[PDB]
Design a protein around this nucleic acid. Sequence first.
DNA 1: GCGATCAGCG
DNA 2: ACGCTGATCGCA
Length: 579
Amino acid sequence: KMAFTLADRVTEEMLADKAALVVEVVEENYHDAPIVGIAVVNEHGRFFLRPETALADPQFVAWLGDETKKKSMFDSKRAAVALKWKGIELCGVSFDLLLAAYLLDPAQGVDDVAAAAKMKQYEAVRPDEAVYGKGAKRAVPDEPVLAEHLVRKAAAIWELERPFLDELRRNEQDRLLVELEQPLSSILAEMEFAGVKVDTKRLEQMGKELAEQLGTVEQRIYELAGQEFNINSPKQLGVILFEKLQLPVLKKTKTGYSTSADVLEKLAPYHEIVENILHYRQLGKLQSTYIEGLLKVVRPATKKVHTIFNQALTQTGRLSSTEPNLQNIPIRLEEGRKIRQAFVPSESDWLIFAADYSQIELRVLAHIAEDDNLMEAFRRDLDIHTKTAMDIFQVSEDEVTPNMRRQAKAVNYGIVYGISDYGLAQNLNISRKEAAEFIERYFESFPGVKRYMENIVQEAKQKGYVTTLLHRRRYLPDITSRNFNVRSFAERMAMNTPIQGSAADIIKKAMIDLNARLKEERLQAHLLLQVHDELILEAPKEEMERLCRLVPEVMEQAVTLRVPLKVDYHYGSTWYDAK
DNA sequence: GCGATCAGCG
DNA sequence: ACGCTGATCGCA
Ligand SMILES: [Ca+2]
């Protein structure tokens, strides 16, 4: 029903200097995945290509790799990484409909061309789910059906770039697309394809010792409980604690007794079993997610894991990381932190280099709220978390344990993002009256923060949305809801999203500038991971001293705020030692 | 599939 | 009754 050429060879009119390009990878994880078909729409017509012909044709390969031949795409990172696994470089992507859609409205959850097209009343393309099926029924259709679907996606991309660019421009988001998100897409593609090497011998040895300690703690739990049970069974666990042992019920879930770690910590005066259960769960978490789960995704020939950074998922502009998640590798407990010893450089005589912003959201908040005292604090490079711990526990700076600092950290963010006196009383094990008075005293010292929280909620109600420093936008329709609980959740999004999102804009800008400086200095160093406010790189040993000067400077100069940005950095033989 | 839970990020 | 995530597991 749409005219296109089912091409047998590549011809010169398919290689125009501007085109819409579809390089179709059906598998959710695109690493090393098949490319099932290619479509090209340009001023000369519409074309479908079989991958085994086009990707072995040297004029098409060169066209893909020519930066001056501009391509409009949907999810260019997926295509660029799948092509890298084919030994082919994709350059010249000048418009990415996924990232355009995500900037205009992150809550659409746009995951295919049909969903983005609908935003502009374009419906001459089908949802990917309707063409391929779902679950065990998923299949590549017959070539005529495939070709027409890939041509329709390309034709849609071709039509939609202009209306998306126009709305982006009206939102002040077009430089955000073209100068930030789209260049970041190519950097993430390199990071994902390079991967992270893993010491599988060390992991597997940790797994065996973990399995030994797991059984022991099981038996101490069975003994303390009198009997056996499925320590992960909420009904059987709930029955042991709250019926057999008759511990108080501090919290219920929609399903029944809560056994979350906060409950169990409060029950520790009552019985020794709850601490063994916490230790059991923690050991089980390391074994399931970080030992077995990671060995499951290691590519065996290279011992590399290749995460996927979702760049158009979070409602704040943060990345997320999937399969494996390399943004939530343990660090706080020493047992879990040793897993970071299995993450190693990919070449001998290379090192891991990590750098991260300290207290970035509080600095962003100081700049945006223009709170005099909070700006002064950061102009002094004070450690707000340690200072707040000193205040809470009535101790001195040397007496601040790491755990009391983690506590103060959650108080600092909690208060600015709307924790109630109840919530803070629960977290510090203090009375509710002392929690309310503490909070009022915190805003006495930072009245500009309080003004800003009130102003940003009223601005959300008037505009319908909130924005970040680089004009990322999040719509908040529940901000005028009549239900109190719905409206309250939306108000705390208005308080938090401009700050967390601005901090995500800054690290993205820093990654782009870092890559350019690394190329300007001709270093072999390259990014491996982003963890929200940290960058992880690997480089030859011989470049570490350069990176110690270059990387903190690039990150600190990514933007100019009314307070300085501060960056800490470490390097070493494994990710564990890069702290 | 979904909720509870927990790992990370602020 | 601070916010943003992803993976695992049991399933009142
Ligand atoms: Ca940090």
